[PDB]
Symmetry: D2
């Protein structure tokens, strides 16, 4: 991550009012980038957006990505050189009760974003965040490789598989490598999941639910204790997104493809483990009661020189620290900035 | 194809004002089905819709499939037991010019249709027409199998790949074969391409262009003489769609998957040959100056489906249909007889 | 198939005393090629080898392909420009009772043949006959494509999958396309199955057994009347082998890969129908008396069609008519050497 | 790995005179197994076989696995319950000049072994060592999964792909999990590569050559400083082989398939760093002079179904390599030293 590269860059971020978007926006701000965000009002209360004062250091616009023209104008007005598309209906459970809204937001929203970029021009790098769930689920023990089939069982997962197809076609049709000397836009998709960190209040997700139980000194009710997942601190995939954006900007079409970001497998553990480790780090008032989808990230490692930095223990520790600070009244804007620095200064 | 099965069935057809939709609607009408169509105004002039008087024997509604509520009510008002979704922005060329409209129409339109079916209830069989182009193109000599990856280069092809994904998720989430005893809806997708026949006036389409030249007693100049495409008369895939619909209705979820329909590879012919045959079929006033394919073993083995007309026969009927159109023949009755001739084959 | 091309070509054929090998040898002879065969004594009595006088118009050597040096010498002595490797333990049933012999014959036999070719030099085209059974069986309704995985359940099928691997490695290591300008050898494998025709006296094979029944005016007993197999007249895949050989010779490494040869699936006919058609072609003295399979092994032959311009010539009915004809002429005492030559001519002249 | 399980077990090991075979034989001996080996004379001088006195505590037979009858009689005489097939022509380079012998040894040798087992009867577990190179090489960045295509460019790699096919057919035809209740034989294949450790004197091998230079106090000349290979101490895959053998014996056909064993990719290190660490570990007298992918395996199956996992990172492994070699040079009893190394491994985590 080259701080000097980000200084002064005009970066447009959809979904800046969310969990991942907030951390990314804060990170970009600390590196001196000129950032503009486009999202609906923060999805939860509390929210990282408000607690870490994400809006104060950037141009923040509230809008629906399904509003094709409003989005077009937002990008035209800003003239970004780099775009991170993170806005989406991210909940599986909810996708079952609101499938239409999930497809319109995740598929058409992506179409409208790419169309805006196509017409506005000048965008050098586009990083479209889809999901680790975009892959046709084979229900096997192996991590998915980027060249495998897109799909998805539930509307959310499937809409992300569709978003991947959309990005592929837009790239081939309007941002083709052979014509890169003309349009100059390098478009890529990034696939990652099981993101955890301080500031995520999407309760239905395990970690946020755990932290809420702990704060109330009430036992957290674990659904599937034996469920194994590849947990990773939110800054891990984000570091990959930033690294990729840099390569897309400076090197070009060579990196305009799909990319997996995830933790080392030897790190993955069952939810039972996560909770137990967290209980220890938290201390008093912490208790509980009662194959797997993963990605092969050899491509990011071999072609981007990417690698995670924090093991699960370090990650869970930072989580407890962040949440306890928030509860204690600490300035979470500065605290979050320091967390980014700690990550950045970890080698 | 049980002529008796279709009698009285309430069939809803999106895209009934188009080429394939018109032939399907006419076919359903001749078999005694109660048909309702939902489409935008016929895409061309002339059109099979008007020339073959498709609307006469059915309920015809003009509406946009992107209008979620209008579609919902149209289906609720009709209470169909069988649905054929054929409405879509079908042009590759146009998709490069209007990518957004292509995705909204082909992807969201399919989403709105399935959502309507989900809420209205009572639908027993759903046949969603996607495209032979829904497959991620490996650009090889082999015909694609139904279990291979979805994708698509251009917005049109890609939107069809997306439509396949959408249908798969809706089926798994809301019309799961495991819960068939509850919802009773068998949902499938059908993949076919290179459809030709009398009554198609889409521009830039090879066959229609050849006829456009003939009717103008002007020589047609071909640009790709060696190009091979698995051409098939429009009634060939439609017969497969009807056969599948019957199976979905009577047998159920066992057939709720994706299905390829296409001609036998041995029937594969280059355009130069196609032009020659057509010139010979037309007569005076006619002159001139790997490839994507599908493996249809599944339709054959599980549906007992199989093509009926070789390319020659198809080209002959194409010329017959068109020359008759120019001659002032009643194309509604002529088209009905064509369907009967097809049904009689074998 | 260019008859002119074969005139004077030195062709070495292993398995010339067998069913497919005999028809191929006879075909090569009629086109003026100088042929030498290397096989064990004909596998059955009667045999096409003896009934059609296969040896009379060629050099016929009896030897085991598992005898590395004897095979090397037989080849070095002959200096062939074209080689067709058809010798193998071809029975699945037997492979269960003699797995070791199956592997030694099909795998090491192929290794010894390729090694001999490597050292003798001068060979321009090598066509190694493996089997339609070389593919890892996915138990599905689709025809296999040449780029799919090799394997095999039983020792025979598996040994053929191994023969494919062996040929691939020998080509990559010693007959690499990148070095064609030096060695000049174009090596390929051909995959085909369900071959039928006059002159096959293998045991427990439906067509031959049907003829044996007709032969003794005994009703032919049928077990699974619904059984389907992509049957093809022996000359169909052989025409493909010859076409490929010519291309390997004249064009080179461009064709040094694996190739599928089979009939059109539209030709797929169950056994009951087959028996019925043969009963009709046979006439007086023919009759017949009585688990289902969801799928049957088949091949996708788009590659041969597109890249070689290959195409089958006879539907099953036509083929069955020729089968019955060949048999009764044999039974009547007809000169089967000349009869078989005419059959080859009829095939070449078809269309 | 259950020491009590191995006590008294009759284990037959082909290739016991080699590098991997010697360590495995020593390991089996320390756990109380009754071991018999069948190999050609040790391939090198020096050899682990002689230096670590591998033959002392076992029945050692010298024979060619291409001698179908001799191998048959060797197995019949011993009546093993567990068999580890490690004998093979393991060199890629040699396979180019001797392809026939490579195929005869690796393919027919495997056929003869399985045929012997088929007829002798009583064998409960068979672990056939093939190679990480049995996979059709796509030349990509991803680790191969057990369900992917067999193949191989060179005769050695290809012969291992063939050995996999042979084992699959023999299992399906004669040791089918469907009638395990009859034959009682659970047959599996194990795929692993880039094995390093004390006692390997194979020629033209990076680690052994580094030690050859160090032992002569001469700089080692490095020609491929950036080359990366999933190096692993010899005891790592062997622990997997032993664990699998136990499961095949006790649980049965459920484990009669192919299995990958390798190090974690996060452990991937280029030869330059390897030479550096080794120079540091050796000390006085050690010195050196100066593609976008590499063949690797996905070992999720071994992890998930066998509960297997690597125990030593590369650094720990290199330290033990240097230690083993320096002790050998110092006149240390390498039989006891090697036994202790096995114990150290068993004690890890
Ligand atoms: N957190 C994870 O574990 C995980 C796993 C896979 C994928 N993702 C993806 O990462 C992105 C960020 O997810 P997150 O965890 O921060 O979720 P989040 O809910 O905290 O953030 C989602 C953002 O999307 C915006 N948004 C949603 N619908 C919108 C619409 N119609 N118009 C405009 N903005 C809209 C929201 O306002 C919000 O800022 C999403 O694309 C999500 O699918 C997250
Ligand atoms: N004809 C072919 O060769 C071929 C090949 C592949 C796929 N298809 C598919 O078959 C179907 C029929 O194609 P066709 O050749 O008859 O084309 P067509 O253009 O003649 O018919 C298209 C129909 O779609 C309807 N439609 C389009 N957009 C609509 C919208 N927004 N709202 C409502 N109705 C709308 C039109 O009114 C028309 O009736 C399409 O789904 C097409 O993608 C056809
Ligand atoms: N006929 C089919 O339907 C079919 C299907 C797949 C593959 N094949 C393959 O085609 C080839 C020809 O089969 P076929 O039907 O003519 O069978 P066949 O039994 O009539 O001919 C086999 C030939 O192999 C020779 N042979 C066998 N073992 C030998 C050995 N050790 N040394 C030397 N020669 C030996 C025999 O002498 C004989 O000439 C074989 O490779 C067979 O596996 C045939
Ligand atoms: N060491 C590695 O990195 C690696 C990588 C892949 C595969 N392997 C496989 O692991 C096994 C052990 O290899 P290794 O490193 O110990 O090699 P090695 O050369 O040290 O041992 C090979 C053993 O094979 C025996 N052998 C060879 N040919 C024989 C024959 N014809 N008859 C009887 N015995 C014969 C030798 O006598 C020796 O004991 C082999 O199967 C090899 O292919 C090793």
């Amino acid at each position: 991550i080259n701080n000097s590269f980000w200084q002064g860059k005009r970066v447009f971020v959809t979904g800046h009012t969310g969990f991942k978007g907030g951390w990314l926006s804060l990170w970009l701000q600390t590196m001196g980038a000129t950032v503009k965000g486009y999202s609906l009002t923060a999805p939860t209360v509390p929210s990282l957006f408000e607690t870490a004062r994400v809006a104060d250091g950037m141009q923040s616009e509230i809008g629906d990505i399904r509003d094709q023209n409003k989005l077009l104008e937002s990008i035209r007005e800003f003239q970004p050189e780099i775009v991170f598309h993170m806005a989406a209906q991210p909940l599986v459970r909810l996708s079952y009760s609101e499938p239409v809204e999930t497809y319109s937001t995740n598929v058409m929203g992506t179409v409208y974003l790419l169309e805006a970029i196509r017409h506005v021009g000048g965008v050098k790098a586009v990083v479209n965040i889809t999901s680790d769930k975009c892959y046709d689920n084979k229900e096997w023990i192996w991590g998915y490789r980027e060249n495998e089939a897109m799909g998805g069982y539930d509307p959310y997962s499937n809409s992300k598989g569709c978003a991947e197809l959309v990005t592929s076609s837009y790239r081939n049709s309007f941002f083709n490598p052979a014509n890169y000397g003309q349009h100059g836009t390098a478009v890529a998709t990034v696939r990652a999941g099981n993101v955890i960190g301080g500031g995520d209040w999407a309760l239905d997700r395990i970690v946020p639910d755990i932290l809420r139980a702990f704060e109330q000194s009430q036992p957290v009710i674990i659904r599937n204790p034996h469920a194994i997942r590849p947990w990773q601190h939110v800054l891990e995939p984000l570091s990959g997104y930033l690294l990729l954006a840099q390569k897309l900007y400076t090197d070009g079409a060579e990196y305009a493809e799909g990319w997996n970001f995830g933790p080392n497998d030897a790190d993955a553990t069952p939810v039972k483990n996560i909770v137990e480790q967290m209980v220890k780090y938290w201390g008093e008032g912490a208790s509980w009661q009662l194959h797997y989808l993963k990605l092969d990230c050899s491509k990011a490692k071999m072609q981007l020189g990417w690698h995670p930095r924090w093991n699960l223990n370090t990650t869970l520790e930072y989580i407890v620290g962040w949440h306890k600070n928030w509860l204690s009244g600490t300035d979470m804007h500065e605290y979050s900035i320091t967390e980014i620095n700690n990550y950045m200064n970890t080698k």
